């Protein structure tokens, strides 16, 4: 009785969700009819689907998902894919016409017409929940329904719900590679509405996933099947303390107590330590202490910021598999003795560990192998300050020559939100500068 | 469910459209009489985007055809695919224009424009949720340039927020094929720079350069040249026609690549082009496409972009390909050539992939590049226009039947500012 | 199945039926119209994936009193 | 017993639903072929005149 | 928990690599899938279930000799990530090896060595070999020396160098890199000794009848040298002495350390019919200078420091009777201040036998070591024949053009002359 609704927005939200709901169905016995297989099961006695499923009178199950898009084509494939019989036919909310890479269109003109339909449907899964914990926004930063339409959920989901712990998983635009040229306008104007309105906000750039695939594994040339399979592992490992029993149960509430110093500092990083190829997995031991010092590396941190620049603020660990609660307290002995990994002065303890029993599965055709031990390490670094200083220098080259603005003015958006949002993230960027200064 | 209304203009417009509906049909798999007989249903699940349905599965293309000379309007009714357009939509003219633009705009242009508007609003009422409009014309003639400029001027009364593309045929820099062409061409652009949200530029001799050099076809007629450009105008409107991994329709291509609303003059090209000699020889991987689209030689508007700088470029990738491969191979065009890319935009390229390729190929791609090379084009006509205005050459064919001489000088100021607009954004 | 074996543009004559690739975990796929997201839900089940004990997560005794009232 | 008996009328209602959609498709295609025969007769009488 | 790391640098080094790793692969029987058909735990490290990995590196700056290693039989016996290759060949060039090319993979090699440093708990010695003859050997090994020393400082790093002959060589502007390496081996290694081995040309046909050899028939005996040095660490003995205990006794003056001797019974089956081998008799055969593996002579030199490695059916009675009876005769001139001149190590297990080599099966074997002043005459001959090319400035531009000076050339020689002025008084 610990429900946890996941709501996905946009083309990044759908295609992460396809990899996400591949894995959730495969952990339990949900085949794409939704009926668990009949093996003349006398007992049954499994109530591990209840976080992400609801049991009907028949053998079916329905997920909690609210797939939302303004673009009808990518939501049309999940309508006629092999998961056609799984999702309830109304939960695949589509739009009527696309947003097309405009924050103004995504938030003012074409994103406002759909939203009166979805927010009824979140109630139809809210009332079914009994002890609902918090949501999971899956969204992007490039396009209109990822940047602007998600800006309009957060201004109305906060006042309608309040004390539910919302979490998100963005895809930050890279410092060097890019798909769109208009995206630094979107990525500043989306912070001002998600600084106040997202409780905890995980954030992963698509460069280190683009880098760790070509380097740790023996594979080259991946697509978004191989990126979103990796992100779909992280979302399962965070929530898995709600699904399967272990030694220390870190639910969704206790992360944000142990990871956020100040309410304006809630942007941690994320990693995944035993990512390895199945040709490569049986060569090396993957011990308890081999998956932590090979997790504090600067080469396997999923955002393009180097943590040898800033100093660590808070760290959280989520082990998974066959892990004794002893050797996680001797791996810390190797980390804290080093001089490379600096913690901030006012945080002596600086850790939060968690153990869970059930080892990860593999999807058939999946790049990462099966293991016995696995850990996801969420840390809060000061060195995330440079992932914005690389961005706003690509925003002044926009705005001081005043290019690409004539699209944004006539939609229903005035110019005053540009210079307000630039100084607003400049208020946030100064706040990281002061907490890293040592107090004597 | 969201769809595009095709509409043509002129003898060049009609002859393009007869080979545009010739190449969209059996990629959807349609017989010469209008019954779907293709293999897989994936092409059937959104066939309504360019097609319309009737009794017993008899499909009707929804294109609106207008031309003033009925002697070449019947040439496409006698073609192989002439029996699929419904003959209510043929709007013939009883007399020709005479290649003066204002005849196509004032005297014998305004006579038919009540009828051409009658069939589109009858059609657009029958549309479900319309998205855009599609136009083909040449600038060089009063049948094509004059008629289209009167249509697009007062279609913005009724359909303002509908995303309009026009696929012009800009006159060639070496030989323009009409004597009194540049009066028509300079007067056309003033109705183009304020109305049309996008416009393309197909030099007629740059397609001749392709059959000169790349394909090296022996005997290319206009059936061959119309087929080379009709594939390009199929690649743009494709991500709403098939599913993809990172899709991009017409609105996402527009708001992501023009920086300023009177700076929208484009420059297209189509990537996989191979002669019969080199086709046994040629590599086929993803960086082999970056050779083709970013070759200035394979560019179907005349001016080489070494004389200017790009602002934003587009690259839609029809095929089943690795996403990283595209993304890795797009910075490596920016790095070794960073002198042809401006500095107040961080990244220039626009990425789009669609899974279903053109019928048979592995991969294919289309490039649309907004350049400052085109000021070297637009500087040419403005000099070419002044040589016939100051000495009043061929004046009386336009003055005595239409507007006075101010409209020429106003069209100079609408033209001279744009060339100064490109240059100010060049550095 | 060609537009023109040498049309003003490209052309190719082939059997789409044979233009299909089967899946050991699934079935053949019209390669001519190969599904870009074909892999999506394109696999064959294996208890091999099944890890160790099914030991799952549930709390009936909770409701036993929680679902019910109390002192 | 009751939890078993829900699935049988589940399966039965989906089976009969698939049957009635097949019947609807059959009568629609018979309609279409009747129309095509009428238009062929129309083409014939026009040519005879 | 007594690790040693081994290095096969050079074309001569991988022709050791066949031999040295064939004898490591028959000291314990190692299948080429790493599962045997806890003495191995110097080299290997057990994986999760059942595979063993040797932490030994073939460090060559051309992919050709590395892909010959991979197309050898032992494909998955050597794990390919440890072995260093380089995309652009250095080709004698210390500048390209050190500065320009090596700086992009130096972080990769250091990532690898800090990845296996967690296995490296009780490490007894980073054994290094290298030839001087090219950018395979000199520069990238040198930069590893400095960067590993500033990463730990304390750990054991040892080196048993390879040196050019006076008569023959592969490249002949190679004395540039030999002078540079004599300058740069003094800094950040505990040890640098004798695999200079020109005399293995003499030995491989003098004693074992195999005329027309390769480098491999020589390098069997270089591997057998390696076995005698590190086998006392690898196996329990009567009076075993490990490598840290070696380093705390081998080095009199902390910049003065360079000996010369052999593995003693380098004897084939043809002589092994008849020669009744004794510890005394084989060391009697050994003490003759003409069967050395350093081209020098301590018969006319001063037998200063010593060491002894014994394997097999060795008795303290036998070794001490030999010590006494050869200590008597002044046909060997002994040294001034040091009275005795012997130190002993004892091994139970007799050395393994590899086919396709010079040697034959032995009940037992002896060695020696004799650290003398006989490298002074060899460095004097290298002094005699280096200055001919630095008078008229050969090949300097190829070095200079990528990131160096003539200052390092004008410093390394004077540092080597400083080491000779260390050597001339003792």
Swiss-Prot record, chain B:
Task: Tell me which GO cellular component terms the UniProt record holds.
Answer: axonemal microtubule; intercellular bridge; mitotic spindle; myelin sheath; sperm flagellum; tubulin complex
Which tissues is this chain's protein expressed in?
Answer: Widely expressed. Expressed in the retina and the cochlea.
- Keyword check for Acetylation: yes
Q: Where does Mg(2+) bind?
A: 69
Describe the PTM: Some glutamate residues at the C-terminus are polyglycylated, resulting in polyglycine chains on the gamma-carboxyl group. Glycylation is mainly limited to tubulin incorporated into axonemes (cilia and flagella) whereas glutamylation is prevalent in neuronal cells, centrioles, axonemes, and the mitotic spindle. Both modifications can coexist on the same protein on adjacent residues, and lowering polyglycylation levels increases polyglutamylation, and reciprocally. Cilia and flagella glycylation is required for their stability and maintenance. Flagella glycylation controls sperm motility.
| Name of this protein | Tubulin beta-4B chain
Which CDD domains did the record assign? Answer: beta_tubulin (cd02187)
Primary role: Tubulin is the major constituent of microtubules, a cylinder consisting of laterally associated linear protofilaments composed of alpha- and beta-tubulin heterodimers. Microtubules grow by the addition of GTP-tubulin dimers to the microtubule end, where a stabilizing cap forms. Below the cap, tubulin dimers are in GDP-bound state, owing to GTPase activity of alpha-tubulin.
Q: Which residues bind GTP?
A: 11, 69, 138, 142-144, 204, 226
Cited PANTHER family: TUBULIN
Residues modified as Phosphoserine = 172
Annotated organism of origin: Mus musculus (Mouse)
Give the sites modified to Phosphothreonine. Answer: 55
Curated annotation (Swiss-Prot), chain C:
- Please tell me one Gene Ontology term that the record gives under cellular component: axonemal microtubule
Question: What are its GO biological-process terms?
Answer: axoneme assembly; cilium movement; determination of left/right symmetry; flagellated sperm motility
What does the UniProt keyword field contain?
Cell projection, Cilium, Cytoplasm, Cytoskeleton, Flagellum
For this UniProt entry, what is the primary localization, expressed as one broad class? cytoplasm
Give the signal peptide as a residue range, or say none if absent: none
Q: What happens when the gene is disrupted?
A: Mutants born at the expected frequency. At 8 dpc, they have a reduced beat frequency of nodal cilia. The motility of tracheal cilia in adult mice is also affected. 25% of tracheal cilia axonemes have missing dynein arms. Double Pierce1 and Pierce2 mutants show high levels of embryonic and pre-weaning lethality. The few mice that survive birth display hydrocephalus and laterality abnormalities, dying by 20 days of age.
Q: Which residues form a coiled coil?
A: none
The compartments listed are: Cytoplasm, Cytoskeleton, Cilium axoneme; Cytoplasm, Cytoskeleton, Flagellum axoneme
Q: What does this protein do?
A: Microtubule inner protein involved in the attachment of outer dynein arms (ODAs) to dynein-decorated doublet microtubules (DMTs) in cilia axoneme, which is required for motile cilia beating.
Family under the similarity heading: Belongs to the PIERCE2 family.
Assembly and binders: Microtubule inner protein component of sperm flagellar doublet microtubules. Interacts with CFAP53, ODAD1 and ODAD3; the interactions link the outer dynein arms docking complex (ODA-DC) to the internal microtubule inner proteins (MIP) in cilium axoneme.
Query: What is the protein name given in its UniProt record?
Result: Piercer of microtubule wall 2 protein
Which species does the entry assign this protein to? Mus musculus
The gene name reads Pierce2
From Swiss-Prot, chain D:
Describe, from its UniProt entry, the tissues in which this protein is expressed: High expression in testis. Expressed in pachytene spermatocytes and post-meiotic spermatids.
Tell where it localizes.
Nucleus; Cytoplasm, Cytoskeleton, Flagellum axoneme; Cytoplasm, Cytoskeleton, Cilium axoneme
Q: Knockout: what is the outcome?
A: MNS1-deficient mice display situs inversus and hydrocephalus. They are sterile, exhibit a sharp reduction in sperm production, and remnant spermatozoa are immotile with abnormal short tails.
**What is the stated purpose of this protein?**
Microtubule inner protein (MIP) part of the dynein-decorated doublet microtubules (DMTs) in cilia axoneme, which is required for motile cilia beating. May play a role in the control of meiotic division and germ cell differentiation through regulation of pairing and recombination during meiosis. Required for sperm flagella assembly. May play a role in the assembly and function of the outer dynein arm-docking complex (ODA-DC). ODA-DC mediates outer dynein arms (ODA) binding onto the axonemal doublet microtubules.
The similarity comment for this entry is: Belongs to the MNS1 family.
Summarize the subunit comment: Able to form oligomers. Microtubule inner protein component of sperm flagellar doublet microtubules. Interacts with ODAD1. Interacts with BBOF1.
What is this protein's record name? Meiosis-specific nuclear structural protein 1
Give the species.
Answer: Mus musculus
Gene this chain is encoded by: Mns1
Which residues of the intact protein are shown? 345 to 393 of 491
Swiss-Prot record, chain E:
Annotated Mg(2+) binding sites = 62
Classify the source by domain of life. Answer: Eukaryota
* EC number(s) stated in the UniProt entry for this protein: 3.6.5.-
Annotated binding of GTP, by residue: 10-12, 15, 62, 90, 131, 134-137, 170, 174, 197, 215, 219, 243
Q: Which GO terms describe its biological process?
A: adult behavior; adult locomotory behavior; cellular response to calcium ion; centrosome cycle; cerebellar cortex morphogenesis; cerebral cortex development; dentate gyrus development; flagellated sperm motility
Annotated coiled-coil segments of the chain: none
Its subcellular locations are: Cytoplasm, Cytoskeleton; Cytoplasm, Cytoskeleton, Flagellum axoneme
* Chain positions found as 3'-nitrotyrosine: 273
Q: What does this protein do?
A: Tubulin is the major constituent of microtubules, protein filaments consisting of alpha- and beta-tubulin heterodimers. Microtubules grow by the addition of GTP-tubulin dimers to the microtubule end, where a stabilizing cap forms. Below the cap, tubulin dimers are in GDP-bound state, owing to GTPase activity of alpha-tubulin.
Name this protein carries in UniProt: Tubulin alpha-1A chain
Which gene underlies this protein?
Tuba1a
């Amino acid at each position: 009785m610990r429900e946890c609704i996941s709501i996905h927005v946009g083309q990044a939200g759908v295609q992460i969700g396809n990899a996400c709901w591949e894995l959730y169905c495969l952990e339990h016995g949900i085949q794409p009819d939704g009926q668990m297989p009949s093996d003349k099961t006398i007992g049954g006695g499994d109530d591990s689907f209840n976080t992400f499923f609801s049991e009907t009178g028949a053998g079916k199950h329905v997920p909690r998902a609210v797939f939302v898009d303004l673009e009808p084509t990518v939501i049309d494939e999940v309508r006629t894919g092999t998961y056609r019989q799984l999702f309830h036919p109304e939960q695949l909310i589509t739009g009527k016409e696309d947003a097309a890479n405009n924050y103004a269109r995504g938030h003012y003109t074409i994103g406002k017409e759909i939203i009166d339909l979805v927010l009824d449907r979140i109630r139809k899964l809210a009332d079914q929940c009994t002890g609902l914990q918090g949501f999971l926004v899956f969204h992007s930063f490039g396009g209109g329904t990822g940047s602007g339409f998600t800006s309009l959920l957060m201004e109305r989901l906060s006042v309608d719900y309040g004390k539910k712990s919302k979490l998100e998983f963005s895809i930050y635009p890279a410092p060097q590679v890019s798909t769109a040229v208009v995206e630094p306008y979107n990525s500043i104007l989306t912070t001002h509405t998600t600084l106040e309105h997202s409780d905890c906000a995980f954030m992963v750039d698509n460069e280190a996933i683009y880098d760790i695939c070509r380097r740790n594994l023996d594979i080259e040339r991946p697509t978004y099947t191989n990126l979103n399979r990796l992100i779909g592992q992280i979302v399962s490992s965070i929530t898995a303390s709600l699904r399967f029993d272990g030694a220390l149960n870190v639910d969704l509430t206790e992360f944000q107590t142990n990871l956020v110093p100040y309410p304006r500092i809630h942007f941690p990083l994320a990693t995944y330590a035993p990512v390895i190829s199945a040709e490569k997995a049986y060569h090396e031991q993957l011990s308890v202490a081999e998956i932590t010092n090979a997790c504090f590396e600067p080469a396997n941190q999923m955002v393009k910021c180097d943590p040898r620049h800033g100093k660590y603020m808070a760290c959280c660990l989520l082990y998974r598999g066959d892990v004794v609660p002893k050797d996680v307290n001797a791996a810390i002995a190797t980390i804290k003795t080093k001089r490379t990994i600096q913690f901030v002065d006012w945080c002596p303890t600086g850790f939060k560990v968690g153990i869970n029993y059930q080892p990860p599965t593999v999807v058939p055709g999946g790049d990462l192998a099966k293991v016995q031990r696995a850990v996801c390490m969420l840390s809060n670094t000061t060195a995330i300050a440079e992932a914005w200083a690389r961005l706003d220098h690509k925003f002044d080259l926009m705005y001081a020559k005043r290019a690409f603005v004539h699209w944004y003015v006539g939609e229903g958006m005035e110019e005053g939100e540009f210079s307000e949002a630039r100084e607003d993230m400049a208020a946030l960027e100064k706040d990281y500068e002061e907490v890293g200064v040592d107090s004597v | 469910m969201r769809e595009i209304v095709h509409l043509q203009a002129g003898q060049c417009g009609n002859q393009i459209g007869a080979k545009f509906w010739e190449v969209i049909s059996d990629e959807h798999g349609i017989d010469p009489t209008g019954t779907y007989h293709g293999d897989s249903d994936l092409q059937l699940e959104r066939i309504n985007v360019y097609y319309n349905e009737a009794t017993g599965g008899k499909y009707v293309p929804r294109a609106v055809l207008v031309d003033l000379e009925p002697g070449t309007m019947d040439s496409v009714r006698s073609g192989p695919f002439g029996q699929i357009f419904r003959p209510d939509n043929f709007v013939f003219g009883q007399s020709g224009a005479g290649n003066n633009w204002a005849k196509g705009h004032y005297t014998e242009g305004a006579e038919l424009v009540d009828s051409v508007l009658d069939v589109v609003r009858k059609e657009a009422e029958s549309c479900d949720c319309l998205q855009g409009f599609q136009l083909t014309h040449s600038l060089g003639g009063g049948t094509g340039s004059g008629m289209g400029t009167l249509l697009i001027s007062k279609i913005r009364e009724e359909y303002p927020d509908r995303i309009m593309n026009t696929f012009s045929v800009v006159p060639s820099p070496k030989v323009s094929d009409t004597v009194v062409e540049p009066y028509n061409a300079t007067l056309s652009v003033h109705q183009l720079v304020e109305n049309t949200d996008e416009t393309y530029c197909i030099d007629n001799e740059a397609l001749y350069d392709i059959c000169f050099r790349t394909l090296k076809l022996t005997t290319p007629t206009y059936g061959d040249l119309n087929h080379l450009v009709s594939a390009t105008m199929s690649g743009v409107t494709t991500c709403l026609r098939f599913p993809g991994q990172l899709n991009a329709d017409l609105r996402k291509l527009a708001v992501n690549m023009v920086p300023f609303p009177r700076l929208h003059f484009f420059m297209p090209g189509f990537a996989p082009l191979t002669s019969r000699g080199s086709q046994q020889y040629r590599a086929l991987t993803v960086p082999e496409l970056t050779q083709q689209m970013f070759d200035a030689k394979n560019m179907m508007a005349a001016c080489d972009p070494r004389h200017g700088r790009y602002l934003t470029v587009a690259a839609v990738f029809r095929g089943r390909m690795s996403m990283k491969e595209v993304d890795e191979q797009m910075l490596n065009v920016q790095n070794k050539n960073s002198s042809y890319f401006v500095e107040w935009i961080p990244n220039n390229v626009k990425t789009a992939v669609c899974d279903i390729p053109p019928r048979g190929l592995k991969m294919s791609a289309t490039f649309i590049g907004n350049s400052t090379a085109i000021q070297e084009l637009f500087k040419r006509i403005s000099e070419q226009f002044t040589a016939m205005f100051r000495r009043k050459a061929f004046l009386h064919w336009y003055t005595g039947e239409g507007m006075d001489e101010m409209e020429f000088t106003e069209a100079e100021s609408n033209m001279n500012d744009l060339v100064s607009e490109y240059q100010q954004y060049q550095d | 199945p060609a537009l023109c074996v040498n049309p003003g543009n490209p052309v190719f004559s082939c059997m789409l039926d044979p233009k299909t690739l089967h899946t050991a975990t699934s079935l053949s796929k019209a390669q001519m119209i190969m599904y870009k997201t074909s892999a999506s839900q394109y696999g064959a089940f294996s208890p091999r994936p099944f890890f160790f004990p099914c030991k799952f997560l549930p709390q009936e005794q909770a409701f036993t009193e929680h679902l019910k009232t109390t002192g | 017993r009751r939890q078993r008996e829900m699935k049988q009328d589940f399966e039965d209602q989906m089976a009969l639903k698939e049957l009635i959609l097949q019947a609807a498709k059959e009568e629609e295609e018979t309609f279409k072929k009747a129309m095509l025969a009428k238009f062929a007769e129309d083409d014939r009488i026009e040519l005879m005149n």
